[PDB]
PDB file of C-alpha atoms and ligand atoms in Angstrom:
ATOM      1  CA  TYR A   1      -1.027  21.949  10.244  1.00 52.28           C
ATOM      2  CA  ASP A   2       0.282  18.918  12.211  1.00 53.92           C
ATOM      3  CA  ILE A   3       3.372  17.730  10.131  1.00 55.85           C
ATOM      4  CA  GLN A   4       3.362  14.398  12.044  1.00 58.36           C
ATOM      5  CA  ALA A   5      -0.386  13.472  11.863  1.00 56.57           C
ATOM      6  CA  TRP A   6       0.060  11.380   8.692  1.00 55.76           C
ATOM      7  CA  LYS A   7       1.673   8.504  10.577  1.00 58.03           C
ATOM      8  CA  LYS A   8      -1.256   7.592  12.788  1.00 59.13           C
ATOM      9  CA  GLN A   9      -3.657   8.250   9.862  1.00 59.27           C
ATOM     10  CA  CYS A  10      -1.641   5.718   7.816  1.00 58.47           C
ATOM     11  CA  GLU A  11      -1.582   3.271  10.678  1.00 54.64           C
ATOM     12  CA  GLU A  12      -5.437   3.499  10.928  1.00 54.23           C
ATOM     13  CA  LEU A  13      -5.802   3.081   7.136  1.00 56.31           C
ATOM     14  CA  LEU A  14      -3.562  -0.018   7.189  1.00 60.88           C
ATOM     15  CA  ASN A  15      -5.795  -1.344  10.025  1.00 61.42           C
ATOM     16  CA  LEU A  16      -8.858  -0.849   7.739  1.00 60.62           C
ATOM     17  CA  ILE A  17      -6.958  -2.477   4.816  1.00 60.94           C
ATOM     18  CA  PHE A  18      -6.110  -5.502   6.947  1.00 60.13           C
ATOM     19  CA  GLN A  19      -9.888  -5.842   7.895  1.00 61.71           C
ATOM     20  CA  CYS A  20     -10.863  -5.895   4.101  1.00 63.10           C
ATOM     21  CA  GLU A  21     -11.195  -9.401   2.745  1.00 65.25           C
ATOM     22  CA  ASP A  22      -9.763  -7.968  -0.553  1.00 61.70           C
ATOM     23  CA  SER A  23      -6.382  -7.504   1.181  1.00 61.22           C
ATOM     24  CA  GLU A  24      -5.869 -11.240   1.976  1.00 59.27           C
ATOM     25  CA  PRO A  25      -3.361 -12.097  -0.846  1.00 61.91           C
ATOM     26  CA  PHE A  26      -1.428  -8.805  -0.372  1.00 61.54           C
ATOM     27  CA  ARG A  27      -0.965  -9.145   3.467  1.00 61.79           C
ATOM     28  CA  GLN A  28       2.355 -11.003   3.244  1.00 63.89           C
ATOM     29  CA  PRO A  29       5.056 -11.369   0.556  1.00 62.43           C
ATOM     30  CA  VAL A  30       4.010 -13.466  -2.459  1.00 62.54           C
ATOM     31  CA  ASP A  31       4.909 -17.197  -1.918  1.00 65.31           C
ATOM     32  CA  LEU A  32       7.472 -18.290  -4.510  1.00 66.03           C
ATOM     33  CA  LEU A  33       6.614 -21.990  -4.035  1.00 63.82           C
ATOM     34  CA  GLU A  34       2.939 -21.166  -5.048  1.00 62.67           C
ATOM     35  CA  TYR A  35       4.190 -18.811  -7.890  1.00 62.04           C
ATOM     36  CA  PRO A  36       7.718 -20.019  -8.831  1.00 61.65           C
ATOM     37  CA  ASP A  37       8.133 -17.538 -11.803  1.00 65.89           C
ATOM     38  CA  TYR A  38       7.136 -14.446  -9.668  1.00 63.56           C
ATOM     39  CA  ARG A  39      10.636 -12.873  -9.479  1.00 65.13           C
ATOM     40  CA  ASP A  40      11.106 -13.358 -13.285  1.00 65.23           C
ATOM     41  CA  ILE A  41       8.302 -10.707 -13.777  1.00 68.44           C
ATOM     42  CA  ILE A  42       8.304  -8.635 -10.543  1.00 70.10           C
ATOM     43  CA  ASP A  43      11.427  -6.585  -9.611  1.00 69.15           C
ATOM     44  CA  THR A  44      10.542  -5.383  -6.011  1.00 71.54           C
ATOM     45  CA  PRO A  45       8.134  -7.481  -3.916  1.00 72.93           C
ATOM     46  CA  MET A  46       5.927  -5.341  -1.659  1.00 70.09           C
ATOM     47  CA  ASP A  47       3.008  -6.390   0.640  1.00 69.64           C
ATOM     48  CA  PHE A  48       1.073  -4.665   3.410  1.00 68.48           C
ATOM     49  CA  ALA A  49       2.974  -6.255   6.311  1.00 68.93           C
ATOM     50  CA  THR A  50       6.208  -4.835   4.852  1.00 68.21           C
ATOM     51  CA  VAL A  51       4.560  -1.391   4.535  1.00 70.98           C
ATOM     52  CA  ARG A  52       3.244  -1.516   8.119  1.00 71.84           C
ATOM     53  CA  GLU A  53       6.620  -2.684   9.494  1.00 72.84           C
ATOM     54  CA  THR A  54       8.441   0.080   7.521  1.00 72.33           C
ATOM     55  CA  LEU A  55       6.000   2.666   8.989  1.00 73.23           C
ATOM     56  CA  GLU A  56       6.310   1.244  12.511  1.00 71.50           C
ATOM     57  CA  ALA A  57      10.186   1.166  12.306  1.00 70.42           C
ATOM     58  CA  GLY A  58      10.130   4.907  11.555  1.00 68.99           C
ATOM     59  CA  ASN A  59      11.520   4.293   8.061  1.00 66.97           C
ATOM     60  CA  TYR A  60       8.990   6.392   6.151  1.00 68.82           C
ATOM     61  CA  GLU A  61       9.705  10.189   6.191  1.00 68.58           C
ATOM     62  CA  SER A  62       6.393  11.124   4.451  1.00 70.60           C
ATOM     63  CA  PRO A  63       3.112   9.613   3.479  1.00 72.38           C
ATOM     64  CA  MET A  64       4.162   9.998  -0.193  1.00 71.80           C
ATOM     65  CA  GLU A  65       6.788   7.321   0.374  1.00 74.62           C
ATOM     66  CA  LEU A  66       4.206   4.939   1.984  1.00 73.71           C
ATOM     67  CA  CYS A  67       1.874   5.676  -0.918  1.00 74.34           C
ATOM     68  CA  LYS A  68       4.602   4.710  -3.432  1.00 77.97           C
ATOM     69  CA  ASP A  69       5.066   1.337  -1.729  1.00 75.94           C
ATOM     70  CA  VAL A  70       1.315   0.602  -1.566  1.00 76.19           C
ATOM     71  CA  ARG A  71       0.977   1.543  -5.229  1.00 78.49           C
ATOM     72  CA  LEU A  72       3.814  -0.957  -5.995  1.00 80.78           C
ATOM     73  CA  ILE A  73       1.628  -3.735  -4.372  1.00 78.35           C
ATOM     74  CA  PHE A  74      -1.026  -2.916  -6.895  1.00 77.58           C
ATOM     75  CA  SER A  75       1.268  -2.470  -9.918  1.00 73.69           C
ATOM     76  CA  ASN A  76       2.947  -5.828  -9.055  1.00 72.15           C
ATOM     77  CA  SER A  77      -0.531  -7.502  -9.078  1.00 73.26           C
ATOM     78  CA  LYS A  78      -1.364  -5.866 -12.475  1.00 73.24           C
ATOM     79  CA  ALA A  79       2.052  -7.002 -13.952  1.00 72.17           C
ATOM     80  CA  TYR A  80       1.757 -10.569 -12.629  1.00 72.06           C
ATOM     81  CA  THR A  81      -1.923 -11.180 -13.516  1.00 74.85           C
ATOM     82  CA  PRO A  82      -2.376 -13.495 -16.542  1.00 71.82           C
ATOM     83  CA  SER A  83      -5.825 -11.850 -17.142  1.00 71.02           C
ATOM     84  CA  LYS A  84      -7.583  -8.508 -16.281  1.00 70.69           C
ATOM     85  CA  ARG A  85     -10.459 -10.815 -15.110  1.00 69.03           C
ATOM     86  CA  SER A  86      -8.255 -12.600 -12.479  1.00 69.54           C
ATOM     87  CA  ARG A  87      -9.697 -13.060  -9.018  1.00 74.14           C
ATOM     88  CA  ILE A  88      -6.626 -11.683  -7.213  1.00 71.92           C
ATOM     89  CA  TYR A  89      -6.199  -8.794  -9.694  1.00 71.25           C
ATOM     90  CA  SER A  90      -9.901  -7.926  -9.308  1.00 70.87           C
ATOM     91  CA  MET A  91      -9.414  -7.829  -5.507  1.00 73.07           C
ATOM     92  CA  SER A  92      -6.360  -5.503  -6.089  1.00 71.69           C
ATOM     93  CA  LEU A  93      -8.465  -3.055  -8.096  1.00 73.03           C
ATOM     94  CA  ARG A  94     -11.114  -2.742  -5.435  1.00 70.09           C
ATOM     95  CA  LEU A  95      -8.515  -2.443  -2.667  1.00 72.95           C
ATOM     96  CA  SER A  96      -6.676   0.220  -4.749  1.00 76.31           C
ATOM     97  CA  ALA A  97      -9.865   2.248  -5.094  1.00 78.43           C
ATOM     98  CA  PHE A  98     -10.417   2.020  -1.336  1.00 78.24           C
ATOM     99  CA  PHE A  99      -6.847   3.005  -0.605  1.00 79.92           C
ATOM    100  CA  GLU A 100      -6.802   6.002  -2.973  1.00 81.55           C
ATOM    101  CA  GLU A 101     -10.156   7.278  -1.613  1.00 78.26           C
ATOM    102  CA  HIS A 102      -8.654   7.348   1.937  1.00 79.30           C
ATOM    103  CA  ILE A 103      -5.040   8.377   1.325  1.00 83.57           C
ATOM    104  CA  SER A 104      -6.056  11.541  -0.681  1.00 83.66           C
ATOM    105  CA  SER A 105      -6.806  13.565   2.496  1.00 81.47           C
ATOM    106  CA  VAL A 106      -3.699  12.230   4.265  1.00 79.44           C
ATOM    107  CA  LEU A 107      -1.451  13.485   1.440  1.00 77.61           C
ATOM    108  CA  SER A 108      -3.251  16.808   1.064  1.00 76.07           C
ATOM    109  CA  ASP A 109      -3.109  17.532   4.807  1.00 76.91           C
ATOM    110  CA  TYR A 110       0.558  16.636   5.037  1.00 76.47           C
ATOM    111  CA  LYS A 111       1.555  18.769   2.092  1.00 74.92           C
ATOM    112  CA  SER A 112      -0.538  21.719   3.433  1.00 71.66           C
ATOM    113  CA  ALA A 113       1.192  21.349   6.848  1.00 68.19           C
ATOM    114  CA  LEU A 114       4.617  21.356   5.227  1.00 63.52           C
ATOM    115  CA  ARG A 115       3.733  24.427   3.225  1.00 64.66           C
ATOM    116  CA  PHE A 116       2.491  26.179   6.371  1.00 63.71           C
ATOM    117  CA  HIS A 117       5.716  25.196   8.174  1.00 65.08           C
ATOM    118  CA  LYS A 118       7.851  26.750   5.360  1.00 66.57           C
ATOM    119  CA  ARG A 119       5.483  29.806   4.926  1.00 66.02           C
TER     120      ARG A 119
HETATM  121  O1  LIG B   1       0.808 -15.588  -3.085  1.00 68.89           O
HETATM  122  C1  LIG B   1       0.076 -14.646  -3.007  1.00 68.89           C
HETATM  123  N1  LIG B   1      -0.419 -14.099  -1.797  1.00 68.89           N
HETATM  124  C2  LIG B   1      -0.165 -14.602  -0.510  1.00 68.89           C
HETATM  125  N2  LIG B   1      -0.560 -14.188   0.709  1.00 68.89           N
HETATM  126  C3  LIG B   1       0.002 -15.082   1.632  1.00 68.89           C
HETATM  127  C4  LIG B   1      -0.115 -15.168   3.003  1.00 68.89           C
HETATM  128  C5  LIG B   1       0.548 -16.221   3.672  1.00 68.89           C
HETATM  129  C6  LIG B   1       1.281 -17.180   2.899  1.00 68.89           C
HETATM  130  C7  LIG B   1       1.381 -17.109   1.537  1.00 68.89           C
HETATM  131  C8  LIG B   1       0.763 -16.050   0.935  1.00 68.89           C
HETATM  132  O2  LIG B   1       0.676 -15.773  -0.433  1.00 68.89           O
HETATM  133  N3  LIG B   1      -0.408 -13.858  -4.249  1.00 68.89           N
HETATM  134  C9  LIG B   1       0.024 -14.315  -5.576  1.00 68.89           C
HETATM  135  C10 LIG B   1       0.365 -13.300  -6.674  1.00 68.89           C
HETATM  136  N4  LIG B   1      -0.657 -12.234  -6.526  1.00 68.89           N
HETATM  137  C11 LIG B   1      -1.046 -11.441  -7.629  1.00 68.89           C
HETATM  138  O3  LIG B   1      -0.911 -10.282  -7.619  1.00 68.89           O
HETATM  139  C12 LIG B   1      -1.704 -12.138  -8.762  1.00 68.89           C
HETATM  140  C13 LIG B   1      -2.367 -11.620  -9.840  1.00 68.89           C
HETATM  141  C14 LIG B   1      -2.986 -12.707 -10.519  1.00 68.89           C
HETATM  142  C15 LIG B   1      -2.625 -13.821  -9.758  1.00 68.89           C
HETATM  143  O4  LIG B   1      -1.860 -13.471  -8.736  1.00 68.89           O
HETATM  144  C16 LIG B   1      -0.430 -11.486  -5.309  1.00 68.89           C
HETATM  145  C17 LIG B   1      -0.631 -12.357  -4.084  1.00 68.89           C
END
């Protein structure tokens, strides 16, 4: 029922994501010189370095907020892809599956801890 445990669990999961080859394109903000129309399609750039820095600054209150930003990385990739068969989109789908498999317990444990706190 540790209400704070999610933060180190998220740090460890980001470490695993950074070791995944599939995270390569998502590890820093999209380069606008490589993709000059990127901000005509995508509203809010997110990448994993921005998520890690936000966590490490103490600017997430809950793992739900971190999860929303990670999911934005993946929805941005789906919105920008010209094809569902894209290399970088295909990498996003595998990385998303990996992320969702690991974040599930982090969310469940946090929400259970909060419920216990408010019992
Ligand atoms: O420019 C990058 N990644 C990147 N990672 C860097 C590290 C260092 C310097 C520049 C970097 O640029 N990507 C393009 C857009 N993409 C898509 O979601 C997508 C779907 C279909 C085609 O692209 C996301 C990542």
